[PDB]
Subunit: 255 residues, 4 copies
């Protein structure tokens, strides 16, 4: 990932934090972001208090990189929220509230960074790499998981839309969705806990008697293994990778 201007949202969460530091490990010129003021950022040159649900937010991202590097050669649409809760008890406003961050996190972003992710596509042979974080829960939907699965199913599909159309409009901006599994983040630290609140679990360790084993590979993911193809995608390695479904899920779904 040499001479590549990047950016990554949500990179102060479990997966987020690593993606920045293992993208300077990739030696890409990262810019980090998160909802928060400012704290400890490793590798990344610059940070922005960011919420992928804030249009004005995003501009600040464009105008920065604009001055800062004058191009954008990567984009990891990452920041997103996972929720588990009774459907005939969930409002429509909850349903949007998920999409807001997970789906319309991708769009307003990439619309704002569109003048930029142009320039970046041109100055590299492989292209401007665009990475959306869907899931396995966007591949296979889950029970009591209704609005969380429809999120990553759009984060599945929007990608195809973004690769093929951008290809259409000439641009060389590769787009590719991302499909993790039941990642060990403190988010999921209290999401099995929410399978409990819906009865399907006597205790927290009996729902944590499902997620690892729905994986053949037999264990909760770790937020380390996830950067490996993320750099890959962003780099002229995956030059010929568009529209794709990049899946790292312990063989969760195949089975």
């Amino acid at each position: 990932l040499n001479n590549v201007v990047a950016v990554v949202t949500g990179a102060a969460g479990g997966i987020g934090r690593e993606l920045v530091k293992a993208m300077k490990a990739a030696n890409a010129i990262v810019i980090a972001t998160d909802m928060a003021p400012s704290a400890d950022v490793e590798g990344a040159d610059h940070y922005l208090q960011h919420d992928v649900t804030s249009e004005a937010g995003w501009k600040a991202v464009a105008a920065l990189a604009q001055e800062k590097y004058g191009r954008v050669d990567a984009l990891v649409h990452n920041a997103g929220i996972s929720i588990v809760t009774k459907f005939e008890d969930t409002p429509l406003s909850d349903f949007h509230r998920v999409n807001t961050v997970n789906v319309d996190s991708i769009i307003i972003g990439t619309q704002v960074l569109l003048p930029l992710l142009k320039e970046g596509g041109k100055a590299r042979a492989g292209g401007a790499s665009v990475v959306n974080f869907s899931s396995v829960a966007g591949l296979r939907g889950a029970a009591f998981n209704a609005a969380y699965c429809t999120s990553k199913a759009a984060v599945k599909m929007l990608s195809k839309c973004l690769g093929a159309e951008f290809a259409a409009l000439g641009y060389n901006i590769r787009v590719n969705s991302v499909h993790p599994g039941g990642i060990d983040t403190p988010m999921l630290g209290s999401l099995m806990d929410k399978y409990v609140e819906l009865g399907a679990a006597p205790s927290r360790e009996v729902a944590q008697a499902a997620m690892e084993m729905r994986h053949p590979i037999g264990r909760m993911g770790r937020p380390a293994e996830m950067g490996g193809g993320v750099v890959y995608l962003c780099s002229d390695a995956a030059s010929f990778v568009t529209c794709t479904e990049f899946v790292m899920d312990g063989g969760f779904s195949q089975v």
Copy 2:
């Protein structure tokens, strides 16, 4: 489909009326609902003017089935929109306008027809049949169908999540998904005008053939051909057909 109190939104759609007709030879009690005040909706047995995202509107359709029968066996949504648009020029409103008529017509409407749906699986062994139309475009990427495909993707996914959640909470309601290709409808129609106005297809003759040749069946799907697959869905012959990418394309996808 004996003793089938069944609901058919957008019954004045190209596909709409022909499902209405093709459920009568099966001998079902149809309920035609649409945006129009009253037309000659051929086949139906009770007609409503029905805004498909109006919450209190699905309470006038839950009203009648409650009135006349006190059960809902089948639930078929249909009123589904497609914009053709330049992704970077697309309003988010208009992105927000499609998830609403389509994806968000399920989250509301089922809840209001849910009371009479848990009745269906008690009145019928083969259960209660909920059919959100998805489509091929909500399976696979299609540029300048940028705000249309993501929709039916969740329409693809939720179907799953609902159907799964209901069966996990021992409702006898199954939920499937129909995925028609470029169906000889006034929807497959004048969107080839949009393509044209985009200046994206040269002519409709071109546009016709691009949507003709992506099916190696050559023809683009007659609305009554989808009749069979709907019927099967509703029946107790489809009592093991839940949460399915049961297809009807003529060859748009698998190749």
Copy 3:
């Protein structure tokens, strides 16, 4: 709807074998049910023939009748299946080959011998002649102790769409549809778990059946009867435009 439809169903004296015939006759299309059984008590099945489905000499004899007796086939039904449950490391090469042979080659030879009698299907119903390839969720998804089995099914799976696409824009009118049945109750499936326990993967045959049923959101397995109308539908012309399809009748099992 099955009118005028001369059909060939294999594995007829099987479970899903018996039932397919029943429902097709219940729609009232001329079944020509076939199996390896020397003779078979099959409700309605207008015909019965000892037919080895790997054997060419087999489909020959199928075709003799279907020509002489109707001079066409309107619905070819490869239901003829075996299942092999075994560790890849221990699975002989030929075990792989015995399976594919019976479940893919079986299918291949007759869509080649009965292909003549299918081209008239191209003619006798505009709604094409209905090829009904029985894959499975093994054809859909993967499994431990089902190596050769799933691979075999996924050839069936794929062969279908090859035949959906070829037989189409060659003018031949023939739809090829792929049924992928989920857990279906037979002294086939009611004993395919034994093996996992025979291996020892599961302690008991109760537990063999446990996660079996629960791996479908619906929570149970399938009736032989609950595999009925899906063939009928494919063989019904309500779907003249429905080919290359994985017709998934598994109880959502795959999708979640």
Copy 4:
């Protein structure tokens, strides 16, 4: 991280095969490259062998070189391919079988005989060893005049969701993965578009060439070289939690 990783590589003299080699020694992993070709100057490759993959002999020709010289296999590769286009109704079952053993059996004795060293390959390495099989677009979506091919590449796809799932639930650390490439311009994929005239698929050769080009949302025909990158990933332990799943390098083809 392709360091202290002993590979094995088939279809070596093949055009992609060659790209795959360079792009893995310039990552500093320990190559054992294999092919049937009599003579091969396989750039990057530490060792070349003359190997028949429809042969446990050929496969135990590999095994000794990894037996004697090293003591493990960390990245076995199965890269051989035949790419037949045939009329379904002009494929003998033999021509069906020829495209089995080179394409599917090759992966079996590759993985039955090398299984010990795959295990030994999975002990020093974190997320484990990987088998990174080579299917094809054909192996996922369908296409005409690829009957025996698109199956053969489907019988890859699935075999490996079998093999992925069977080893992990065996307490080995020996991952199994697959790629499905799109249109890669090679002499391997060379004048095969002539066939799409000898039958009559599209008028000429260069509009058959651009007919293949058309489909691709990416717009262009890939390169042999491009595969290697998405092969250099899967093998490394930074692609540890990638198993059973179908890593895709097609250029958008499948996705629209």
